Amino acid sequence: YSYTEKKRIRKDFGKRPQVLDVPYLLSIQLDSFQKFIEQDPEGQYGLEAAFRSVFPIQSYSGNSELQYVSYRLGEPVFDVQECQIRGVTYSAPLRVKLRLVIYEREAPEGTVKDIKEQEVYMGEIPLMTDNGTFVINGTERVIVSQLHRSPGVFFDSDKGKTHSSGKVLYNARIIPYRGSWLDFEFDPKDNLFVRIDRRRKLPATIILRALNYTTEQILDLFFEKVIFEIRDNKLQMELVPERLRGETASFDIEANGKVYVEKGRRITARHIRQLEKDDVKLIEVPVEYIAGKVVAKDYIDESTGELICAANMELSLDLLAKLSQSGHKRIETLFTNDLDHGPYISETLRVDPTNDRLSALVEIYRMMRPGEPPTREAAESLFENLFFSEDRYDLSAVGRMKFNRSLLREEIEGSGILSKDDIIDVMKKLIDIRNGKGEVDDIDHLGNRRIRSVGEMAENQFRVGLVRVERAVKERLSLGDLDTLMPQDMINAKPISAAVKEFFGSSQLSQFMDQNNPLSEITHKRRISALGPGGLTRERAGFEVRDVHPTHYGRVCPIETPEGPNIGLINSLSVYAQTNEYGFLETPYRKVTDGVVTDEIHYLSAIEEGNYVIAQANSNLDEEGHFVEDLVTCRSKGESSLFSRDQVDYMDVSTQQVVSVGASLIPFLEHDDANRALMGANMQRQAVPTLRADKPLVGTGMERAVAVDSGVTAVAKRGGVVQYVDASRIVIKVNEDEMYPGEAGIDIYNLTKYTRSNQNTCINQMPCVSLGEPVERGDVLADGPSTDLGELALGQNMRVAFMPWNGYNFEDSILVSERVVQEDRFTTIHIQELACVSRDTKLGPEEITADIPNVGEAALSKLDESGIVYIGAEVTGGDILVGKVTPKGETQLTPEEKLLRAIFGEKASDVKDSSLRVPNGVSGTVIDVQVFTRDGVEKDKRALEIEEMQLKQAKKDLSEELQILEAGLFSRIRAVLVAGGVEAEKLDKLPRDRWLELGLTDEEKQNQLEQLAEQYDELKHEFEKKLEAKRRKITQGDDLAPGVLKIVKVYLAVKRRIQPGDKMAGRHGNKGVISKINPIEDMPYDENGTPVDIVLNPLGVPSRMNIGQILETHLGMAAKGIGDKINAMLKQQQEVAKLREFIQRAYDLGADVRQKVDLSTFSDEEVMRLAENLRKGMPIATPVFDGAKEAEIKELLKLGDLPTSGQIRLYDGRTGEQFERPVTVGYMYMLKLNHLVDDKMHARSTGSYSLVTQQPLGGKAQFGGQRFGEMEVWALEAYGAAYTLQEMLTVKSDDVNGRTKMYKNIVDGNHQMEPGMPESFNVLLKEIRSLGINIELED
Amino acid sequence: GITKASLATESFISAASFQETTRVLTEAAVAGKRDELRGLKENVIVGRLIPAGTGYAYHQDRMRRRAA
Amino acid sequence: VDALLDNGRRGRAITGSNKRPLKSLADMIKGKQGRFRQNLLGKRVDYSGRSVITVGPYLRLHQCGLPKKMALELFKPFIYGKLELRGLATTIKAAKKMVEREEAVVWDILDEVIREHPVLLNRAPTLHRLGIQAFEPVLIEGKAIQLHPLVCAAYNADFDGDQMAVHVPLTLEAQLEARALMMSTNNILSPANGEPIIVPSQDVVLGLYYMTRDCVNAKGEGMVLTGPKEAERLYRSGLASLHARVKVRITEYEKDANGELVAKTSLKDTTVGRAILWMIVPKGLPYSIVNQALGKKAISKMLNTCYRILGLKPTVIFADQIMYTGFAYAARSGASVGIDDMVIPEKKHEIISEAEAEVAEIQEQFQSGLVTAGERYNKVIDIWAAANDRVSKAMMDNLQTETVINRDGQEEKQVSFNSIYMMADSGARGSAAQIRQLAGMRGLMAKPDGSIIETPITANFREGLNVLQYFISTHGARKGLADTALKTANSGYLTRRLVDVA
RNA sequence: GCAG
Ligand code: 118
Ligand SMILES: [Mg+2]
Ligand SMILES: [Mg+2]
C-alpha cells in the first residue's frame, strides 16, 4: 500500500491482474519538447539538428563562412507565475555561439585569414512548464499533437467513380516532408500520367525523359523482350514458356516434334510444363504473329544508313521485310501479354509529344511556369530544384523509411531527395498494382498516419526562421565590409523569434488550455488532431477519415471525440499508447511464447499488429499462464475471429487499453451505448470544481492516476515527516535515507491558493496531510481543485430516485432537492479579472481617481482615496471598482440645455466618467488588486501600498524559507555532532552559529561538517541575492502596451450556487438542466424518512441505452449501505474488533477479485482512521470492461442490509402516501457542468449599434442583440406575420430614424411604427453603385 | 430544378440574394432589368411588408391605388 | 481595378499584410457573408434576449415563464412609459434611475406592462414555422425560460442545455399577430400533415397509459360505481386500485345532427382509471375513446378527435388537462427503471450455443471445400440473423406477458407491468428495437465500409459488452454520429433552395 | 475549442 492509500482504500472489483501500470499520462508533451530543447551531440533532434541543417553558411563566392559551434538557453527572466501575472511569455533566451571565418584572397585552400567567434542572441524560445503547458502572453496554452499523413509513397485508387464505366483508376503519390508533391496516375485509356503539385498532368514518360533515359532505356526498364531471331528461314522465335500462361494461340505449336496445342485452343499450365519438359526454347510461328508487335530497340540500316525502325514502333510484315534486308537477323520485341503485362508505358511513349531530354525539360517548364519562354539553362535548373536538391525537397527520415518500406527495400535509411531509382520504382509498383499483383494503401490506416508533436512542430518553425535569417546573412556576407564585422552584426533575431512567436501564439494547434478540472487539462494534453497546418480542414474532411479504423485499437480512443463538425478529427490518445521514434502510434502487448502468456510487453505499431494474432484482454487464463479455453477470441488482420490457443502470438496488456484516459473513468462503460459513452467522456471535462471535493463512491481506479499525473496536486518528491503544515505551505522533514550529504533535508511545498483558471474557475490547493504525519515519495500532500485525498473528484455523490415526478423532470430535466443547496454541494467559486486601463488620449490623459462626476458619495464609499476598490469589498453589479475619468471636449450644448444650465448654474464637467464597474448580475468579493504603472508615471498611494506589501511579502517568504532551511541544517549538524564526541549536555547552550566552525575529531565526520557549513554559508549568500532580485523585480516599472499609463486589475470571487437552469450531468451521458429546487419536505422519502436528493426521469434510460447509469446507482447504494453501516458502528462506539471484522468482510467480498486487503496488518489507529474515512460510503472501484458483475453488486447490497433489487419503496413527500411501485434509489455521481445559466441569460432592449450597417452588435459581451436569422424570417413569412416581420427588419434593427421614433413612441404609450428603409439596404445600393452598376429606385 | 428555377425568376433581387450574385447582377445590369418587388424576399430586403398575410391587404390597396 | 471590383476572379487574389486575400466590392455583397444574406435577409434585433429553457409544467398552453430579470430589460421603454404615465417618475431619466435601482414599484409596473403582451420564443434551427411561437409571459424568479411541455415537440426542444431567444412584439399590429396568428393555442395542428403537433409525450403518455390499464385481481375489482367521481374517491381513499376492472355508470353526450349535445347513460365495463380519466374528457366525445390502454397514438387520436368534433377552444383545455393528469398519475405510479426490469430470456444461452454449433458446422464444411468463402459467409450471416430473431422473440415473449397472476386462485397471464415494457409499449420512450439491445442480444454490426461483421455482438447492455464487442459497436456509432453531423448541412441547403424556389 |  502506502500511507496515503490506506487512509481510504477503494474496494477493487476488478478481476484481471494487471501487468503494466498506467504510464506517465503526459509523456507525449514532455518527451517531445525535451527532444526539442535538449543538447543532442548526435545532431538529430531539436535545435541542434535545426542548426546543423542550416549552418555552415558559405558566401556566394565562398570567400567567407558563418559556422556554428554550440547553442545554450539562458535562464528565464521571469518564472512561470510572474509570466502569468505580468502577461508575458515564459521563455528562455537562445544564445548561439557562431564563428565567422574569413579565408584569404589568394590561397590554394582559402586558408584562414581570420576567425571571429562570439555568442549571438537569436530569439527567445518558449519553455514547457513542468506540466506540459506553455505560458504564452500570460495564458496557459497547450500545443496539441497533430495526426498527419506520413511522408512516403501512397498508392490509392478511385473505385470506378469516373467515366461511368466503373473502371478503377490507380494513382501513386509521393508526399515529402517538404517540397513538391509528385503524383502518377492512370487515365481511363490506361495511360500513365504525372502531376507535379497537383497542376495539370503530363504523360508520365516526360518525367522519364527529363531524367536522362532514352526511349530505348525506358523500354528496357519497364519491359522484357520476346526475341525474334532469323535463323535459316521462317522467323524462329525464342521462347520462354511461362510467357504463354493463359492465352488462346492463333496457331498450333510444333517444336522439333509433337504438336502441343492446336489452333485456337486455350493454353493451360499443363502446356507450359509440357513445353518446359520438352525444354522448348524455339518456335516458328506464322509471319502475321508480328502484326501488332512493338519493337524494343533502335534498328537502323548499315547499307543506306536509313533508320528502319526506332524503338516503340509497331511492326508489320512490310517493315519486317525492309528490316530483314539489312542483315538484321535479330529482332528484339516487347513482351506485352494482356491482363498481366500491359502496354501502359509503351502506350504513353506515343502520347507524349516529346522526343528528347531537353524538350521534356521544356515541357515540364511550360507546365510549371506557364506563359514564360523556357530557356535551356532555366528549364534544366527548375527540374533539379524540384525533387533533387536538399534545399528544396526533404522526404526526411520517416519519408525514406515509409518509402523503402512501400517499395519493399531492406534499407530504412537513405537520402532525403528523390532519385531516378525511386521514381522508376514508384512507376513500377503503380504498374504492378494495375496488373493486379499489388494492393493500394489504406490512407486512414494508422501505419500511414503519424503523430507530429510539440517538439517537432516547434523545430519546424524554428528552422523556417533559420532559413529566413540565413538568406539575409548570405546576402550580407557577399559584401565588401568583410574585415571589420562580427557575427552578431549580421544576425537578425527578429525573424527567428517571430517564427516561433507566431507558432506558439497563433497556430491552430496552439490552443487556450481547458482548465476546468484536472481531467480537462490532462485530456487536452493527450489530444490528437487531424486538423492544423499541414492537415485536414473540418469542412473538407470526408466521411472516411472521420471513422474509427481497426488500427485505432489501443492507439486512439474510439469514443472520446467531439460531437459537432469536427468529429473523428479531434481524437484522444489511449491509455497506454506511445509513439514510435518515427511518430507512428504503438501500443503494448504481452508475448505468448508457447501458450503461456509471458509478462514481457512489446510495443507494436499498427502494421506489426496486423501480422500477429492477438488475444483479447477478457480472454481468461489460469495462474500458469495458459489459456483456460482452447478457442480464443483474437484479432488477426483487423478481422476478428476465433483461433486456437497455439496460434495466439500476443495479448492485450489491459482491459482498459482501448479507451482514453477520460473514458477510463466511466464506471460500467461496457453497459453504455457508445454515443452515451462519448457524451459522458466529453461532459466529464466540462465539470467545474465544487467547494468541497467528494470522491466517487463508484470509481474505476484511474482517479488516482489522473489526479497525480496532472500537476494540480502537490506530490511529495522525497519521503519524510510533515514538520509543519498550514493552509498555504507544507514543510516535510526528509528521511535521512533520501537526503543528500550537505543539505538541509527539508522540502517546502508552497500551495496555490485561489488563482484563476482559464475558465475563470478557482484552482486552489488544500493541505491533505496533517502535522507530524509520515509521508512517502509519491504521496499526495495537497488536494488541488477537484481532487479528494489524491483521487480525482469532479462531482458529488447525490441520492437519486428514478421516477417521473409531477412533470418536473420531463425531457431530461432534473429535479433537485433544497438540501443540495443548503449543503452547498454544487456551489462553485468563479474568479473574474477585470482590468481598467488608464491610457493617454489626445485630449489629455485619463486618470484613475475617486472624484468622479455625476456620481453620489454612496457609490464611492468602497473606493479608497486612490480611486480603487478596497480588497475584501463585497460588491454587486453596478458598483464602481476603479474610478476613472476621461478628459473631453467638443461640449456643444443644445439651446435648451444652455437655458437649463443658465437657470440653475450647475455647470458641465470637463471630464467624463469612464469608471470600471462590476458587470450586471455579478456579485462577489474583491480578493486581489494589481496595479501596473508605466515607468515615468508617478504611482498613486495604492500602487505604493501594494508595492510595499509585495516587498514585505517577498522579504517575509524568503526569510521564512531561510529560517526553515537553517533550522533543518542545525538539526542535521546536531545529529552529526552527537554521532561522535557527544555534547548532549553542552550542545544546546552554545550559540548555534559556532557549531559551523566547531572542529571535531576528524575521522571522516569533519568532512560532512565542512559540507554542512558550506551549505549554510551558501544559503546565507543565496537568500540575499534572491531577495535583491525580488526587490528589483517588484519595484521596476512595467513594460505596458504603447499608449497606456496604468492598468488596474481587480479580481472578483463569485460563489455561484446551484439554481434552475444550471446543467448537471453524470458520467454516462445523462446530462440535464435543473428544473426546480424542491423543498425538503416535498421530496420523495423512504420508510426511514431520508428524502431523495435528486429525482431523475426513468424514461431517459431505455431509449438512449446507457444502462451503466442504473448499475452505478445500484452499486452506489451498496457502497453507501456499507458506509452507513460503519457509521452506525462509530456512533454506538463499537470496539475496533467489530469494526475490523465488518470492514474485512466488506473488502473480501467479490468473486475472485485481484486485490486482498488484509487489515489484520493494520494497527488500531489505522483501522479507526480508515473506518472514519469510510463512514460516508465505502468507495468502490469498477475498472472499465472488467468491472463488478451484477451478482457482486447484489452481494454487496445484501451485506449492507439493503434490498438486492436496488429498488426500495418511496413515499410521496407531499401527500405522504406511497408510490405504487418500487423505485430505483441509489447514489449517482452528479457533475455540475460549466454551462451555468448565469452566463447564458441575456436581454437587451436598446444598445450599441454596428458601425457600417446600423444593426445591433453581436454578443452578450457587447450587450448583444439576437440574430433574427434567415430561417426565422421564413417562419414569420409562413404565418402571415407581415407586421411583426416588418418591425424585425426596420425599427428593431436597421431603421436609424425609425428606431428612435419607435423608442419615443413606446415611451409615449403609442405602440405604432414609422418604418423607413433599412440602412443595410442603402449600404448595399451604395456598394453596387461602386461596382459601376447603376442600381436605382424607381418612383 | 429548384436551383435553376430560383435563378430564373423575373426578379434580380430574389435571384441575386439566393446565390450566384455575380451572374445575376451582371445579366440584370446589361439587360437593364426592373424588379417590381412582387415576391417576399424583395419585400423583406427593402424593409416593406411582405405581400402575403396581414401585409396582403396593404399590397392589394397599393395595386388598386396606383394602377388607377 | 479588377482586384477592387472582384478580387481573385482573374488569376491570383491580392493579399494584404496577412497573406489573406482582400475583401473586394463584390465580396461585400456576395455569399454567406455578403450584405444580402448576413444583413438584409436576416439581421440582429433589439428587444431580444436569450436563456436556457426549463420545464415549468404548471403552465397553460398559451404561456411561457419569463424571468423578471429578462423582462425588466426587454420591456424597458414600456416601463419608462408607464412610470411617467402613472406619475411615479417626473422624467425619463428619473425612470431610468428607478429601474436601475430596481425599486419595489417597478415590479408592479412590470407586472402591468407584460399583462396581455405576448412574446415570441424561438429555438434555432427554426426548421419550420412552429419554431417561433408567441406565449403570454408569466414572470418567474429564475434565470431560465420556463417552456410549457406540450410545445417542446414542436420546437424539437429537450431540456439538456437548449436555449431559446425571446423577442418582443412592439407595435399593436405585431401584438395582435402574436395573439392571433402565432400564439401557441392557435398552432395545435401541424402545417405539414394535419396531425396534432401539440401532443403528449414521454411522461404524460406513460401516466395516461398506466392509468388506463387493467390488472386482473386488482384491489376493489368488480364493484359497481355511480360515476367517475366515485372512482376518484375510491382511488384516493385507497379502496380501489387504479386498474381495478369495475362497472361504472358513465353519462356521455353525442353531437346531434343539428349540432347540439344529447346525453346517454349506461353502466360501462371499465377500470377505475379510465373512469377517473373520463372526468377531464370534453363532452361531445364517446366513452370508447378512453376505454382502452392509451398509448401515444391513442392520445394523439383522442386530441385529433376532440379537434375535429368540438373545435380549437375545447381541445386546448383538453390538452392541458391531459398534461396535468398524465404528469400527476405518472408521479403516483413511481414507474422506475431497475436492473431487474431488463429480464433476459433463459433460452438466450441455448439459442446462442445452437447458433455457434451451426456456424462451426458451416466452417468445418468450408474446410471440406463444398462451399466457397462467399456462400460460407452468407450462410453464417443468415444463421446468426435467425439466432438474433429467435433471441428477440424469446425476450419479448418473456417480457410482454411475464405477469401471471391469480384470479380466484387460478393463474392467468396478462400484459406485463414491467417498466421497460410499459415504456416501450406506451410509446413513451424507446421501441422494441432498443429493448432488444437491453435484454436480447445486440446483434450483428457493420464495419465502417458497410460490410457486416460475420460474428455478432452476442451480448447486451444488461450484461457487459467485452472490449472487442465494444470496439465493434463504436464502428457504427461514430458512423451514425458523423452522418448526423454532416447531413444537417445537407438538409439545410435543400431547405434553403426550396424556400427560394417557392 | 465548445453548446443544442
Ligand atoms: C466546404 C467544403 C466542404 C463542406 Sb461539407 C461539411 C459541412 C458542415 C460540417 C461538416 C462538413 C463535406 C465535404 C466533403 C466530405 C464531407 C463533408 C457538405 C457538402 C455538401 C452538403 C453538405 C455539407 C463545406 C464547406
Ligand atoms: Mg437539447
Ligand atoms: Mg472553433
SSE map:
The structure is cut from a larger assembly and holds one copy of chain A (1339 residues) and two copies of chain B.
Chain A: E1 11-12, H1 27-37, H2 46-54, E2 57-58, E3 64-73, H3 80-86, E4 91-103, E5 112-126, E6 134-136, E7 139-143, E8 145-149, E9 152-159, E10 168-175, E11 182-186, E12 192-196, E13 202-203, H4 205-210, H5 215-221, E14 225-229, E15 236-238, H6 269-277, E16 282-284, H7 317-324, E17 330-334, H8 344-351, H9 357-368, H10 376-386, H11 396-406, H12 420-434, E18 449-452, H13 454-477, H14 493-506, E19 510-512, H15 518-524, E20 527-529, E21 570-572, E22 578-579, E23 585-592, E24 597-605, E25 614-615, E26 631-635, E27 640-644, E28 650-652, H16 674-683, E29 698-699, H17 703-709, E30 714-715, E31 720-726, E32 729-734, E33 746-750, E34 755-756, E35 762-763, E36 766-767, E37 774-775, E38 780-783, E39 787-788, E40 791-792, E41 795-802, E42 813-817, H18 819-822, E43 828-841, E44 844-845, E45 847-848, E46 874-875, E47 880-882, E48 884-887, H19 895-904, E49 911-913, E50 916-917, E51 924-933, H20 941-977, H21 1005-1034, E52 1044-1056, E53 1063-1065, E54 1072-1078, E55 1094-1096, H22 1108-1131, H23 1136-1147, H24 1164-1173, E56 1180-1181, ...
Parallel strand pairs in A: 1-56, 8-20, 25-28, 29-56, 41-55, 42-54
Antiparallel strand pairs in A: 2-3, 3-4, 4-5, 6-7, 7-19, 8-18, 9-10, 10-11, 11-12, 12-13, 14-17, 15-16, 20-21, 22-23, 23-24, 23-28, 25-26, 26-27, 30-38, 31-32, 31-37, 32-33, 34-35, 36-38, 39-40, 41-58, 42-55, 43-44, 43-52, 45-48, 46-51, 47-50, 48-49, 51-52, 53-54, 53-58, 57-58
Helix pairs in contact in A: 1-13, 2-13, 9-10, 13-14, 20-21, 22-23, 22-25, 23-24, 28-29
Chain B: H1 2-6, H2 12-18, H3 21-31, H4 41-45, H5 56-65
Helix pairs in contact in B: 2-3
The complex binds tetraphenylantimonium ion and magnesium ion (MG) (2 copies).
Chain A binds one RNA strand of 4 nucleotides through loops.
